[PDB]
Amino acid sequence: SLHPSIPCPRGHGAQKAALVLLSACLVTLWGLGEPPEHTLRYLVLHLASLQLGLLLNGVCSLAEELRHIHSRYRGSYWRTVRACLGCPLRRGALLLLSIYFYYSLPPFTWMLALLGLSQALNILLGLKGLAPAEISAVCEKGNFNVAHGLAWSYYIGYLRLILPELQARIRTYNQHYGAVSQRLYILLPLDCGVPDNLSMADPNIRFLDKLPQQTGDHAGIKDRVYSNSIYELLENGQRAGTCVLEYATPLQTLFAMSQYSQAGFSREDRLEQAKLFCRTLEDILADAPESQNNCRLIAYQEPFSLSQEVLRHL
Amino acid sequence: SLHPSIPCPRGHGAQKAALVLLSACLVTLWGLGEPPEHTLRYLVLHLASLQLGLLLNGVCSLAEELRHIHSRYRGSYWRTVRACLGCPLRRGALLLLSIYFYYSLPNAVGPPFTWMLALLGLSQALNILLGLKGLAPAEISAVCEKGNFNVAHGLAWSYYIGYLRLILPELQARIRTYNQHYGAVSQRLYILLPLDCGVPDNLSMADPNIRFLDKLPQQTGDHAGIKDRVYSNSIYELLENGQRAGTCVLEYATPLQTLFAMSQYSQAGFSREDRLEQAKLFCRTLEDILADAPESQNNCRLIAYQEPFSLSQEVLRHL
Amino acid sequence: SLHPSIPCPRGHGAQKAALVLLSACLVTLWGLGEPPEHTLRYLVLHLASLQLGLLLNGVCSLAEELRHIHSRYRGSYWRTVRACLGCPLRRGALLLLSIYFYYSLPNAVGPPFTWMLALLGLSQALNILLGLKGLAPAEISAVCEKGNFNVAHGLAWSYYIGYLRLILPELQARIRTYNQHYGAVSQRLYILLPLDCGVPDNLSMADPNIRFLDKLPQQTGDHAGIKDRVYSNSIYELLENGQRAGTCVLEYATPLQTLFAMSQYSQAGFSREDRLEQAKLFCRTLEDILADAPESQNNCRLIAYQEPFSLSQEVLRHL
Amino acid sequence: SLHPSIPCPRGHGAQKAALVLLSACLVTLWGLGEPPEHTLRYLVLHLASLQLGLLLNGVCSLAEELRHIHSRYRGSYWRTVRACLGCPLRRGALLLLSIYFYYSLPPFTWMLALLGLSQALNILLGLKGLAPAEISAVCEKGNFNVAHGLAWSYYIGYLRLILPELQARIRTYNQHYGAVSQRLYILLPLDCGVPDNLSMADPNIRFLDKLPQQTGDHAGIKDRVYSNSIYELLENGQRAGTCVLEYATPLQTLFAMSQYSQAGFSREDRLEQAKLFCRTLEDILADAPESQNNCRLIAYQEPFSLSQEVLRHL
Ligand SMILES: CC1(C)C(=O)N(Cc2c(F)cccc2Cl)c2cc(C(=O)NCc3c(F)cc(F)cc3F)ccc21
Ligand SMILES: CC1(C)C(=O)N(Cc2c(F)cccc2Cl)c2cc(C(=O)NCc3c(F)cc(F)cc3F)ccc21
Ligand SMILES: O=C(Nc1cc(F)c(F)cc1C(=O)O)c1ccc(-n2ccnc2)nn1
Ligand SMILES: O=C(Nc1cc(F)c(F)cc1C(=O)O)c1ccc(-n2ccnc2)nn1
Ligand SMILES: O=C(Nc1cc(F)c(F)cc1C(=O)O)c1ccc(-n2ccnc2)nn1
Ligand SMILES: O=C(Nc1cc(F)c(F)cc1C(=O)O)c1ccc(-n2ccnc2)nn1
């Protein structure tokens, strides 16, 4: 519910489609009025072909990966073989079953050579690639996303370091001094726009003062200084509200990555990873122990006044 | 060059192995003496069956990608179909070839076209439902490396852009000002890259031979909506047998500490093996960036090390 | 959307036409009713012959690319072979398939393997020597657009990086300083893009209704080894029936003037048709850059026009 | 002679290889001792098939380009057809000749349909692409290079306006002021690494003075000013030469383009276009009327002191 454009996690629509396809194929096989022992024989033979093709692809991948045995696989052949062929025991059982089914069910070495040729063509010309939807699904399942690491690092390195101390500093500033809200408002620009000043993003927002700076050592730096800025959110020139505004710096860096050529990062990838960053940041703040209603994410996309949105969240 | 354990980028060993396999298969087909027409016919029929299976798998995936059309594909069906089934025109041409060459060509090993379609749909549905069509870790790693689908890629580019790209231009001026106003501190930034991702908050606890000495002048600058953000780096000293061997500006790579924390947290879905791989990828990507970046022109150095030891000796060796 | 005559980027009409042609050819092959095995056999034989012709052409090209190995290919033969013949592994696999599927398969229309190779080498040599295997200007334009092999692409990116990326950040401050200390000058730099590339040195001669009014404060900055390079922009006023209708920071795009000069010079190898194509492409590329660039945010406006007229009326209309 | 790594223009090595291949093919046809009427028939049929395939490819390209008729082809169908099919008259003559030879020489519509299918596959899957060497040769022949336009624009827009009066400015400065050279030394770093100051590139080069600025209108800007800088060249810490040093700004922008992701410009392309820029700029200055031994290009590659190179060129 952060923003309507944020993608929801993938469910089981592909599984439902596969179930429907399985049902339809069973219905049409029954309706063909043709003996089912041949059906089972063909199905077993086809799965055997798929298993042997996977074996050959994994053997080629193993030939590639045996150079990285000391680097990625800590100098062990077993981990390399597991990486390139899945579980060795189950894969071996399936390959022996497939070999037996070919050598038993009614040539074989000719089919084996031709299947090896097909697998070689698949590897060399890239026939069996990966569609963008498949890559996205695999990355989201295995958390192989730039945004996942970026948002978890934003939470661990910054947010959990300040949030309770930030509430304490807000209380101290209020009692010393138009009270400021006791929460850090972090803006998430989905599409674009991450100026170094809130005034540049919107002149209606004006820097008011600075919170009592927090100085604590963090990752090899003695007395690291945190300086959070209070902003007045005005409305027709009057102080409608005031609170601690901030921008999610990993979003700025996602934009910068999309700018650089060496990053291998595209505008579509930039927007997608910004959406995932916001999604997983909200997801981990929901279950965070530090987040105790002392942090508010304001996700927005420019089609617009930021100050009105911040007041709406206030 | 940072560390021997950091893996080199993937080469073309798989393609060379595939070429050798193709040559062996061609030699075997020539030796067996089977008619070449049958060999070509069955090869084309196999490729057609694979293409039709890809069609069915793409349709099944489109069944679940169609409800993310507004959120992920800007509400356009063409982008969804392109993401699921690939390029619509090339995929359509390939499926037209597959249909024509299976409906027409004879097939002794394989059922007629309607029976083939039923059986291939059955097998593809089984593969999708049971998860039989899966990717081994090596293929997933290769795809992620080619497509930059790593947490380490983003983390290293973020360490560059968000932190290094800000202090590196002014670090030389700050060190010169410190030297003039007040041994001599080195002019290079020494980023420590522990491959074990053990990053103490206080660097003194890492090794007693490094003790905090002083602080560089604070660099005040606006950044991402924080007015007057303060960068207060630190100047440390290195002790050899208790004597002041050298001084430097030492710190750790914060993304490595966040990687370790992710490996600690359960919700992160991050494992120790994944932690080590992404630490090495972060180090490699940062090294490549600094090699290509114009800001780091003899201005920053990276200390990559693995605990099997004293950090002070390694830093002095790099001095 | 600058001008109607500026061409849109090339779409996929060729691929759609190819798909329609493929469908028609498949329908025709079904209609005649020749054995499908013969169809597949002859298609594979034709593709094999094409691949072997590509091999021969690549070898002939490698004969001339081998003497630029040190200058162009850093002295390594692998880059030369990759440039000439493509990817060595994929090309080798395709060549092995072609050789096997021609020497093995029967062929009623076509010679035996050695006779085919001799005749195909003869034909490829004839194509290379007589220049028969040439590219029509449409394919050359498509390849140049896809690969950014245009003078206009580099010229537009150079106008952005070398000039606009330097004055646009401080243009607002300069105009504000001028306004405070002195009608009111507009806050946007108006870059005129004449598609005829007629760029007068003195903009007054283009149309008398535009007249120079004053000069913005000089921007002094280092750039490309020129110490204290001075950008002295000028402001113009726009007249309507002799009255001061408006005032703005108006200037021309110098790369268009250089394009016109290239069309004038004989050694440039630049024609009037090429001049017009590259002018329109420069306008399109600059528009795309300014749309994507962060420097241009309500700071610069492009006035693209073609003489069939008064420039002042167009600039006022855009005002 | 500007730099050893500068590529020389492509010669006729491909033509010589084609001639050798033609000779070897003639020898082997004579060697097989097999009748030449069948040889001529096969050759004519092969060229006819190639011509028909080119016709089909051009028809597909015409279907693509017919929507750019008003933009690129001035709203005339004849220009679009010429662009997509070459010369209409010669192409038509060749197609009628090929059709007649294909039909007359001992099916036809079946072969035509199969050739159309092959051409459709070539277009859709991109079998008949363009190798990097072929693209480079075509671009060099047709001057479709970024560097060509960049260097011609550098000559016309900058050098053509300062070179005539640079000698007068230098003479005036020398009279008012230990003699500075009467040539503009332009540095051409093949790595496109240009600092904004010569001191940053090499601290042994120090800024000496400023030439009397040249003020003249240029391309819609009244009284555009040029401020050339005289630098100091030092050897062993003492003055050894004084000259007007400058960097080729198109090389700066080539580097910047290689940096930006939107440019579609790579590092290999950056180096190649830097080399072509230097080559064609040296070619332009060889016949430029303005260049009267009042301009010297300096090309170098960092494996080295720039000041020593400038002294060597002095
Ligand atoms: C390369 C070679 C000789 C080969 O090794 N196989 C594996 C294989 C089978 F797939 C099927 C039976 C035996 C073998 Cl032994 C193959 C298959 C075809 C073919 O027509 N497959 C259609 C097809 C099916 F037959 C069953 C099915 F469930 C789905 C399906 F889509 C053509 C050439 C080959
Ligand atoms: C698609 C289809 C049916 C077709 O339309 N042609 C055109 C054509 C010729 F190219 C050659 C002769 C007749 C026809 Cl009619 C074709 C050719 C082959 C083939 O085997 N070409 C080898 C080959 C040669 F025969 C002569 C040569 F100088 C070089 C060469 F490389 C296979 C299938 C076809
Ligand atoms: O790593 C840092 N920052 C970031 C890293 C990211 F990966 C990112 F995506 C965003 C940032 C960011 O903060 O902008 C960082 C490190 C040290 C200090 N520092 C040194 C002295 N005092 C403070 N400040 N920042
Ligand atoms: O994003 C930040 N940090 C990091 C983000 C990462 F993704 C990471 F991997 C490491 C860090 C890190 O520096 O520890 C960050 C943001 C704002 C401020 N801040 C606001 C006012 N004063 C200081 N400080 N740090
Ligand atoms: O177009 C310009 N420059 C360039 C264009 C390129 F395509 C390139 F490759 C490099 C340059 C460059 O000079 O750096 C340009 C235009 C106007 C003024 N100017 C405005 C007021 N006074 C002077 N100055 N420069
Ligand atoms: O490169 C320059 N100009 C251009 C280059 C182009 F490629 C182009 F298409 C247009 C121009 C142009 O501005 O006319 C240039 C370089 C140095 C100085 N300069 C040196 C001292 N003071 C001023 N002025 N101009």
Author numbering:
A (entry chain D), D (entry chain B): 5 to 110, 116 to 186, 192 to 317, 323 to 333
B (entry chain C), C (entry chain A): 5 to 186, 192 to 317, 323 to 333
From the paper:
We expressed and purified full-length human STING and incubated the protein with SR-717 and C5339, a TMD-binding allosteric ligand that has been that has been demonstrated to promote STING oligomerization. Single-particle cryo-EM analysis of this sample revealed that STING molecules had assembled into curved oligomers, akin to what was seen in previous structures complexed with cGAMP41 and cGAMP/C5338. Local refinement using a mask around two adjacent STING dimers yielded a final reconstruction with a global resolution of 3.1 Å. Two copies of SR-717 are found in each orthosteric site in the LBD, with the ligands and surrounding protein displaying near two-fold symmetry. The SR-717 pair is stabilized in the binding pocket by the sidechains of Y167 and R238 from either monomer, which form π-stacking and cation-π interactions with the pyridazine rings of the ligands respectively. Furthermore, the carboxyl groups of the ligands interact with the side chains of H232, R238, and T263 via polar interactions. Overall, STING bound to SR-717 adopts the canonical closed position. The lid, comprised of two beta strands from either monomer, is fully ordered above the ligand binding pocket, allowing H232 and R238 to interact with SR-717. The α2–α3 loop in the LBD undergoes an inward displacement necessary to allow for backbone interactions from Q273 and S275 with the neighboring STING dimer to mediate the formation of high-order oligomers. The SR-717 complex induced an angle of 26.4°.
STING plays essential roles coordinating innate immune responses to processes that range from pathogenic infection to genomic instability. Its adaptor function is activated by cyclic dinucleotide (CDN) secondary messengers originating from self (2’3’-cGAMP) or bacterial sources (3’3’-CDNs). Different classes of CDNs possess distinct binding modes, stabilizing STING’s ligand-binding domain (LBD) in either a closed or open conformation. Here, we explore the conformational and oligomeric states of full-length human STING in the presence of closed-LBD (SR-717) and open-LBD (diABZI-3) non-nucleotide agonists, lending insight into potentially distinct modes of activation.
